[PDB]
Amino acid sequence: ERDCRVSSFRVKENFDKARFAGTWYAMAKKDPEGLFLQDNIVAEFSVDENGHMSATAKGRVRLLNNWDVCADMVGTFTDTEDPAKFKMKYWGVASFLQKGNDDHWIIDTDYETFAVQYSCRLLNLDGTCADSYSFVFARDPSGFSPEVQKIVRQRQEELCLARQYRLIPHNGYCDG
Ligand SMILES: C/C=C(C)/C=C/C=C(C)/C=C/C1=C(C)CCCC1(C)C
């Protein structure tokens, strides 16, 4: 039944950049292949006068050589024909941190409690996703109500990502 094609995934209706501004604590995540942020992830979103969205993010990353580093990351977003789908250019303040460009979609959000984000980095020949990442954010570091948890589980299912997220710890590693 349900369609796993990236192109059929619903997104946030009439997304509002200005209401999305602010601090968002990552609560759970579904990792992509390769190096990614491990934990202690906190993102901060901003929208200037011209409507240009940007964000800064802090998170712990395990370098291949076993060092643990706190990554200071920056991302700028470009608008598209869909208010909830953006192209994200990102880079770190330290030269060794990953740089790239990645789609950034806002699956769902109430602006005040939770948000579900999603990025497909590589499409299969059938249109499904072969390499994705998804974050579940909260406005409160204490998490969500059971009521909101139900909604979030729903969205995970529609991303065909159910049963594949892991809880993310916050223990002050990058100053929390
Ligand atoms: C080794 C360093 C690694 C992998 C860093 C990866 C950082 C990455 C995914 C950052 C993504 C985000 C940015 C910039 C802005 C806010 C939201 C996101 C979606 C949190």
Swiss-Prot record:
Keywords: Disulfide bond, Methylation, Retinol-binding, Secreted, Transport, Vitamin A. It comes from the Eukaryota. GO terms for molecular function: retinal binding; retinol binding; retinol transmembrane transporter activity. GO terms for cellular component: extracellular space. It is found in: Secreted. InterPro entries: Calycin, Lipocalin_ApoD, Lipocalin_CS, Lipocln_cytosolic_FA-bd_dom, Retinol-bd/Purpurin. The modification Omega-N-methylarginine is found at residue 121. Detected in blood plasma (at protein level). Substrate binds at residue 98. CDD domains: lipocalin_RBP_like. GO terms for biological process: retinol transport. Disulfide bonds join 4-160, 70-174, 120-129. Transmembrane segments: none annotated. Retinol-binding protein that mediates retinol transport in blood plasma. Delivers retinol from the liver stores to the peripheral tissues. Transfers the bound all-trans retinol to STRA6, that then facilitates retinol transport across the cell membrane. Belongs to the calycin superfamily. Lipocalin family. Interacts with TTR. Interaction with TTR prevents its loss by filtration through the kidney glomeruli. Interacts with STRA6. This is Retinol-binding protein 4.
